[PDB]
C-alpha cells in the first residue's frame, strides 16, 4: 500500500536528518581543531624568532638560522592548515 511506503519514507527522513546533523557537528569540530593548531603554530614561529634574536645578541648565527628553519617549517604547516581550513569551511557550508 502507498500509505505504508510513504510513512516508512517519512520515518527514514528522520534518521537522515540526524545523520546530517552529526556530520555537520563533526565538520565543526574539525574546523575548530585546525584553527587551534594553526593559531598555536603561528606563535611557535614567533618564539623561535625570539630565540633567533637571542642569537642576534651575540655570535650564534647557527642558532639563528636553525630558528629560521623552524620558522620556515612552521609557516609551511600554517599555510597547509589554512588550505585545509578553507576546504573545511567550504564543505561545512555545503553540508549546511
Amino acid at each position: 500500500d502507498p500509505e505504508k511506503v510513504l510513512e516508512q519514507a517519512v520515518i527514514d527522513m528522520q534518521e537522515d536528518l540526524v545523520q546530517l546533523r552529526q556530520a555537520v557537528a563533526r565538520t565543526i569540530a574539525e574546523e575548530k581543531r585546525t584553527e587551534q593548531r594553526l593559531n598555536q603554530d603561528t606563535q611557535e614561529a614567533k618564539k623561535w624568532e625570539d630565540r633567533a634574536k637571542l642569537a642576534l645578541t651575540n655570535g650564534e648565527e647557527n642558532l639563528a638560522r636553525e630558528a629560521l628553519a623552524r620558522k620556515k617549517s612552521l609557516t609551511d604547516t600554517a599555510a597547509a592548515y589554512q588550505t585545509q581550513l578553507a576546504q573545511q569551511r567550504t564543505m561545512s557550508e555545503n553540508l549546511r
Binding site: D1, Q8, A9, D16, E30, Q84
Partner: protein, 48 residues
C-alpha cells in the same frame, strides 16, 4: 649528525603521514556526505 638527520626524518615523516591520513579521512567523510545527499530514496515515497 646521522642521529640528528634521522630524528628529523622520523618526526617529519610521522607527522606528515598522520596529517595526510587525517585529511584523507576528512575528505572521504565529505564524499560520504555527498553520496548521502545524492542517495535520496524518493522512489519509495513515490511508490507509496
Amino acid at each position: 649528525r646521522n642521529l640528528a638527520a634521522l630524528e628529523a626524518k622520523i618526526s617529519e615523516a610521522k607527522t606528515k603521514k598522520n596529517m595526510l591520513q587525517a585529511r584523507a579521512k576528512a575528505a572521504k567523510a565529505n564524499a560520504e556526505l555527498q553520496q548521502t545527499l545524492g542517495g535520496l530514496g524518493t522512489s519509495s515515497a513515490t511508490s507509496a
